Assembly symmetry: C2
Homo-oligomer: 121 residues x 2
C-alpha cells in the first residue's frame, strides 16, 4: 500500500534544453514575434509562463501562424538575450548589451531583473 | 562576435521550476495548450512541444504537425491508468507510484520512451 516517490533533479533542465533546441531549429514553435524588424520564433506557452506581459499578449490569440509585433521600446539587442534566458535560465552579457537588456526587462515588466543580479565569471 | 568580455552573468536556480509550474498550471486550466490527447477514450490537454521534449514516441508523432487544432489518438497500449502519472511526471518532474499501478505505468513509460527516469529507483523490465 505504501508510495514510491521519484523526484528528478535533471528533468526540468532537460525539458528546457529540448524546448530551446526546438526554438533554434524552428521546430514545433507557434508564434513569431517581430522585434525591431527581426523575427523570433518561440512557444507562446513558454513565454507566458515567464511573464504576465506575454500572458496578456498571447492568451486569446487564435490564428494559423500567429504573429505578434512588440512596440518600439523593445529592441532586438535587449530582447534576444531575454528570450534565450526564458529558454536557459541563464543571462550572459557584456558592456555592449547589458544596459539594453536591463531596459528591455523593465518594459517587459520582469520583476527585479536589475544591475545587482549580475556576477562576474 | 561580442564586444567586451561576456562576463556579466546571471543564472537563476528557480527559473526552470517556475516555467514548469506555469506550464503545469496552463495544462490544468486548459489555457495556452495546443494538443488534445485521447487515451482510452479520456481527453488530456497538453503542449505538443512539451510532450516532444519528454518522450521519443511523442517527438516522432508530433514533429511536423503545424496545425492549430490537434487531436492525437494513442493506441491501445496506452491506458489512462499508466499514462496519467507519466503526463504528470512530464509536467512536474515527480512520479508517484504504488504496488497497484507501477507495472502499468512502467510498461507505458517504455512504450512512450519517456526521458529522465533513468536516475530513478525503478527497474524497466
Amino acid at each position: 500500500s505504501p508510495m514510491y516517490v521519484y523526484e528528478s533533479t535533471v528533468h526540468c533542465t532537460n525539458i528546457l534544453l529540448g524546448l530551446n533546441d526546438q526554438r533554434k531549429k524552428d521546430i514545433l514553435c507557434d508564434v513569431t514575434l517581430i522585434v525591431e524588424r527581426k523575427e523570433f520564433r518561440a512557444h507562446r506557452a513558454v513565454l507566458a509562463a515567464c511573464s504576465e506581459y506575454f500572458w496578456q499578449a498571447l492568451v486569446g490569440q487564435t490564428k494559423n501562424d500567429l504573429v505578434v509585433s512588440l512596440p518600439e521600446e523593445v529592441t532586438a539587442r535587449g530582447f534576444g538575450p531575454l528570450l534565450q534566458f526564458a529558454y536557459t535560465a541563464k543571462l550572459l552579457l557584456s558592456r555592449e548589451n547589458i544596459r539594453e537588456v536591463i531596459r528591455c526587462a523593465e518594459f517587459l515588466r520582469m520583476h527585479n531583473l536589475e544591475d545587482s543580479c549580475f556576477s562576474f565569471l
